[PDB]
Amino acid sequence: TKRVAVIGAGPSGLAQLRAFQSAADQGAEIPEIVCFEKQANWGGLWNYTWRTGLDENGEPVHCSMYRYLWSNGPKEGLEFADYSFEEHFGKQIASYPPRAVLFDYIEGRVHKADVRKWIRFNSPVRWVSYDAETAKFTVTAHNHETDSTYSEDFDHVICASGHFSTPNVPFYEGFDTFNGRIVHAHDFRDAREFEGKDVLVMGASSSAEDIGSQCWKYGAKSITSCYRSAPMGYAWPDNWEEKPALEKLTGKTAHFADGSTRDVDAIILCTGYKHFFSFLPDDLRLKTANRLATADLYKGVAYVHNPAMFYLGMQDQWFTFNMFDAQAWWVRDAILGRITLPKDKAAMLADVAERETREEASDDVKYAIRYQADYVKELVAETDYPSFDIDGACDAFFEWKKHKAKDIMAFRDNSYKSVITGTMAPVHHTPWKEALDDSMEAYLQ
Amino acid sequence: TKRVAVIGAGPSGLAQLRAFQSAADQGAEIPEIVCFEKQANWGGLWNYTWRTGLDENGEPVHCSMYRYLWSNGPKEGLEFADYSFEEHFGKQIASYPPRAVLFDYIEGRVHKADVRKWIRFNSPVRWVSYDAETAKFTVTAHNHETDSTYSEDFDHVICASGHFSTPNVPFYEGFDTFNGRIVHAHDFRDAREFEGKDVLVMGASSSAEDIGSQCWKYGAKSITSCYRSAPMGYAWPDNWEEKPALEKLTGKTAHFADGSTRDVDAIILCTGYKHFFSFLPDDLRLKTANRLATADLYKGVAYVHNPAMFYLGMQDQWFTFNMFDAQAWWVRDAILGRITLPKDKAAMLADVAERETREEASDDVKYAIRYQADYVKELVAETDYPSFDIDGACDAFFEWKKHKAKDIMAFRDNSYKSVITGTMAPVHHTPWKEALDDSMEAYLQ
Ligand SMILES: Cc1cc2nc3c(=O)[nH]c(=O)nc-3n(C[C@H](O)[C@H](O)[C@H](O)COP(=O)(O)OP(=O)(O)OC[C@H]3O[C@@H](n4cnc5c(N)ncnc54)[C@H](O)[C@@H]3O)c2cc1C
Ligand SMILES: Cc1cc2nc3c(=O)[nH]c(=O)nc-3n(C[C@H](O)[C@H](O)[C@H](O)COP(=O)(O)OP(=O)(O)OC[C@H]3O[C@@H](n4cnc5c(N)ncnc54)[C@H](O)[C@@H]3O)c2cc1C
Ligand SMILES: NC(=O)c1ccc[n+]([C@@H]2O[C@H](COP(=O)([O-])OP(=O)(O)OC[C@H]3O[C@@H](n4cnc5c(N)ncnc54)[C@H](OP(=O)(O)O)[C@@H]3O)[C@@H](O)[C@H]2O)c1
Ligand SMILES: NC(=O)c1ccc[n+]([C@@H]2O[C@H](COP(=O)([O-])OP(=O)(O)OC[C@H]3O[C@@H](n4cnc5c(N)ncnc54)[C@H](OP(=O)(O)O)[C@@H]3O)[C@@H](O)[C@H]2O)c1
């Protein structure tokens, strides 16, 4: 029987397993599926750990999430089309669940799917090579439970290893002598650490917004965020100042591009991540910027230089969970033969070029959201993934953007229409800034 | 011609290059040598970086050294037999030089040797395999300068990748909810961070002693160190208490095995390291405890299951630099044919078993130092490495041990006789406790 290797059991890899199990139930023959996961459990970025740097096994820590993290977008825009929030929880919950609650939801679906038996945990992939003579990938993996490395052959490899875990960590003059903490978002864990401190947050994207907000919520004396392109531009609280580019540090004094200076106690580098695959040779290794049209991926999933290799979730993300589903169903269908890939590499490269050109046609945020919605629509049309109201999910993101513009610190105190019923989610029992307790127990009451 | 791969350009790898260059100068034909180094420069652990976790390229940070680090033992006991301190700096320096000074000394020797041209920097090794049919090792390496992975064939591989860089990081109840910093020694950089703080130092070996001392020197409010075996036992300062095993944390309250408690602000795990090779398959991968008799290494260097593979510096270390030299000369001679390895695997295994039994015969510290001295003596007798006064080196370590027992905080305010001239080194211009400045400049005046 044909064999498929899935690298990673985060939301993407899990979606891939769910896709195959769903086809098997229909009566389709499916390949053998082996999912390799470095961590001790599934969940990907959502599987929280206090650990930073290297894990208990000596492997790079994957987790980039922190304490107090809540859903940063409306949940209504990431609902699985085949497994609703209502089905999982029974009842209606608010629109921005804490990490532990979304983790439960992710896990609930694959528990029902009975796909855990396909996963090997504590088993980082070390290497993948392809031999055209045999038409097989050789996957080398290390099993930390037995301290033994082995290799096995597969007809396909689906890489779902993430791209928000290997940090971009710039050096600025003074970083090495600064008497204070300098920590990348990747290693950030507990906002309580900076209570009563002046925090400098470098960056102007998703992580800067949220980590700055966590530090603010948990009692930072002040937040100073700095940008090198467009400011975030929100109406910040009184103790939050947005400055232009950092130039250098002299002692604990930060110098900015407009000539202004500020003393800071700690620096959090919210400077993003790189696509990094420590386990791939040149001929298989995806090289791309983080954006909505990923380089060298036909239909955003099939590797143009070897289309028997696929990648999931390698785009930057407005949509998340149901985009990964759409991708996983598509990749599944390509492997099963329900979809046939072009034999013309020129055609695959042109597909990517079209996507890049279309992404770049406008820099408008609503255009970007709609662009990715269009991508999900495109993939869903080409498989049996249950169609869902993508326009409705789109409107949720539009409303979410409006809410953040109005009150950046209170945007999580809002509800959105379910794409299934059209009904507004309930108000949560506690305002975000006062909801210091993380637990799922406290959230669900 | 024959080819040798050296993995790592720390003191061990550097000693290996120097060994081969020395033989070439004698008129011996030598193999091609390729040294792969993950970092941007040589020096191994001594090559300091402010970075922790993953480096700028996304690879695990090798550095385990910190600011304010000074030589841990007498320099007279680690002097190269073929390159004295005098020949280098010219003058006579004190006996405990700061990191930056020793780095310069290390650098000095290999600069003179003209071996840098054999080294590829920013080039972590990804994998090594051996094929018996071809009798070749295939080394796969990633060049971060070009973002390109390649592979090449070698007749020998010499692994000098260190074993004090992948940390042992235990979990204790309360670690994940502790409102304070928890950092393994590997990630410890600036003692100033803990000024005015109550610090818990877990451990009772080299790292606990020195990191605890740095925290003390740089103004920690108090140090509580904890042991699970033998206490360190020194006469500690007034604000330093040694406790038995940590049981758990409840909030910031540490509970110990004797029923006592102590509130702490930060925890530094000085809990040691594992031997960890992310780039080796089972049939080549050394598995061993950290000790003086390393498992599965004939003569402490030749891998018993494939003796064309060698390992340097995998022992725990009383002796350092001149032991690595002795090892490197020995491995060189095996490769050149000046030494012939046994064709009897049982004999190689018996060699290791003898070393283990002899190490275990006594737990006395002086016995342990003499044991490794005997190892260096053994290796040096079997090559043309110049013979030096090993007994004198022993006496230096013995004096060092006694100074530490007398005053653990001031042992660095001592001098020792040169192993070449028998002249007591001059006293430094500032007592250790007062010598806050790191610079080599401040040290040398
Ligand atoms: C800080 C942060 C907050 C976020 N918040 C939200 C949010 O609120 N809502 C939302 O919808 N999205 C959020 N995201 C987006 C996130 O990317 C997706 O939710 C989702 O986690 C991506 O799923 P994935 O499976 O593609 O990747 P990941 O979740 O990164 O999972 C990849 C998996 O691959 C494994 N892996 C990696 N290397 C190897 C190897 N060599 N061998 C084996 N396994 C390996 C990892 O251990 C991991 O389990 C957030 C992202 C970040 C960084
Ligand atoms: C905290 C600390 C303090 C110490 N203080 C002293 C002291 O005062 N005096 C003393 O004599 N000794 C000291 N030591 C001992 C130290 O082990 C030796 O001085 C020496 O650094 C060991 O040299 P090495 O080359 O064997 O290993 P390392 O110094 O660890 O160097 C190994 C090299 O291999 C490289 N490498 C690792 N993996 C890869 C890969 N996959 N591909 C390519 N390259 C790789 C690393 O980047 C590194 O350059 C200390 C050790 C520690 C941990
Ligand atoms: N954290 C979340 O809430 C969350 C949730 C889900 C998904 N994600 C995804 O994660 C992706 C990454 O989010 P992110 O905020 O972590 O990273 P990011 O989007 O790449 O943003 C990095 C920020 O740091 C700045 N920066 C980068 N390098 C810098 C340097 N050397 N000096 C100064 N500033 C620098 C960037 O500015 P320039 O624009 O000038 O480069 C940008 O403002 C997002 O696109 C988002 O999809 C995030
Ligand atoms: N020059 C220096 O200052 C320096 C500094 C660091 C390292 N080194 C070199 O590298 C070696 C390592 O030194 P090291 O101190 O870093 O490591 P180490 O010698 O392995 O010591 C580890 C210490 O932590 C304790 N420990 C380990 N696991 C623990 C756990 N789960 N819970 C509680 N305690 C735990 C150990 O106790 P047990 O004994 O009970 O296991 C031991 O006391 C040394 O032999 C030396 O060669 C040198």
From residue A205, alpha-carbon distances to A209, A212, A214, B72, B179 in Å are 6, 11, 15, 45, 27
Is B70 among the annotated ligand-binding positions?
Answer: yes
Is B312 among the annotated ligand-binding positions?
Answer: no
Select the residue from B61, B128, B278 to test the A interface by mutation, using most A Cβ atoms within 10 A: B278
Contact criterion met (CB below 8 Å) for A294 and A315 = yes
Residue whose C-alpha is closest to residue A63's, from A160, A186, A148: A186
3-state secondary structure A347-409: HHHHHHHHHHHHHHCCCCHHHHHHHHHHHHHHHHCCCCCCCCCHHHHHHHHHHHHHHHHHCCC
Q: Six-digit token pair at A370?
A: 């709609």
From residue B222, alpha-carbon distances to B98, B179, B209, B217 in Å are 25, 18, 14, 11
Strand segments, DSSP code E, in A229-307 are 240-243, 246-250, 253-256, 261-263, 266-269, 297-298, 302-303
User: What is the phi-psi region of residue A379: left when phi exceeds 0, alpha when psi lies from -120 to 50, beta otherwise?
Assistant: alpha
> To one decimal place, what's the resolution in Å?
1.5
Q: Which residues of A touch B142 (CB under 8 A)?
A: 278
Beta-bridged to residue A138, according to DSSP, are A129, A153
Cβ atoms within 10 Å, residue A27: 6
Give chain B's count of helices (H) and strands (E).
9, 18
Domains along chain B with CATH numbers: 1-170+271-445 (3.50.50.60), 171-270 (3.50.50.60)
Residue whose C-alpha is closest to residue B178's, from A193, A186, A194, A61: A193
- Collapsed DSSP state (helix, strand, coil) of residue A140: strand
N-terminal to C-terminal alpha carbon distance within chain B: 49
Cα gap B19→B334, rounded to integer Å: 12
| B50 with A176: Cβ contact below 8 A | yes
Non-local (6+) Cβ contacts of A310 within 8 A are A156, A157, A158, A159, A301, A302, A303, A331, A334
| Shortest Cα–Cα distance, A186 to chain B (Å) | 10
Residue whose C-alpha is closest to residue B64's, from B342, B268, B245: B268
Cα gap A13→A120, rounded to integer Å: 12
Cα gap B11→B321, rounded to integer Å: 7
| Shortest Cα–Cα distance, A272 to chain B (Å) | 13
Give the residue carrying structure tokens 């071996």. B115
N-terminal to C-terminal alpha carbon distance within chain A: 48
Residue located nearest, by CA, to atom 46 of ligand 4: B317
Ligand 4 atom closest to residue B205's alpha carbon, by position in its atom list: 15
Q: Six-digit token pair at A61?
A: 């820590």
Among A161, A269, A294, A443, which residue has the most ligand 1 atoms within 8 Å of its CB, making it the best to mutate?
A161
Residue whose C-alpha is closest to residue B279's, from B313, B309, B299, B308: B309
| C-alpha dihedral sign at A154, A158, A164, A169 | positive
- Collapsed DSSP state (helix, strand, coil) of residue A433: helix
Non-local (6+) Cβ contacts of A274 within 8 A are A163, A166, A167, A168, B58
Contact criterion met (CB below 8 Å) for A75 and A220 = no
| A140 with B287: Cβ contact below 8 A | no
Please give the torsion angle defined by the CA atoms of residues A416, A417, A420 and A422, in that order, rounded to the nearest 10 degrees: 170
Q: Six-digit token pair at B222?
A: 């108090």
Interface A-B, measured as beta-carbon pairs within 8 A, has a size of: 89
Please give the torsion angle defined by the CA atoms of residues A269, A270, A271 and A274, in that order, rounded to the nearest 10 degrees: 110
Select the residue from B148, B149, B267 to test the A interface by mutation, using most A Cβ atoms within 10 A: B149
Q: How was this structure determined?
A: X-ray
| B53 with A56: Cβ contact below 8 A | no
Q: Six-digit token pair at A117?
A: 């038996």
Contact criterion met (CB below 8 Å) for A47 and A69 = no
Cα gap B228→B222, rounded to integer Å: 20
| A287 with B147: Cβ contact below 8 A | yes
What count of Cα atoms within 13 Å lies in the side-chain half-sphere of residue A9? 28
Cα gap B284→B161, rounded to integer Å: 14
Q: Which ligand is nearest to the CA of A36?
A: 1
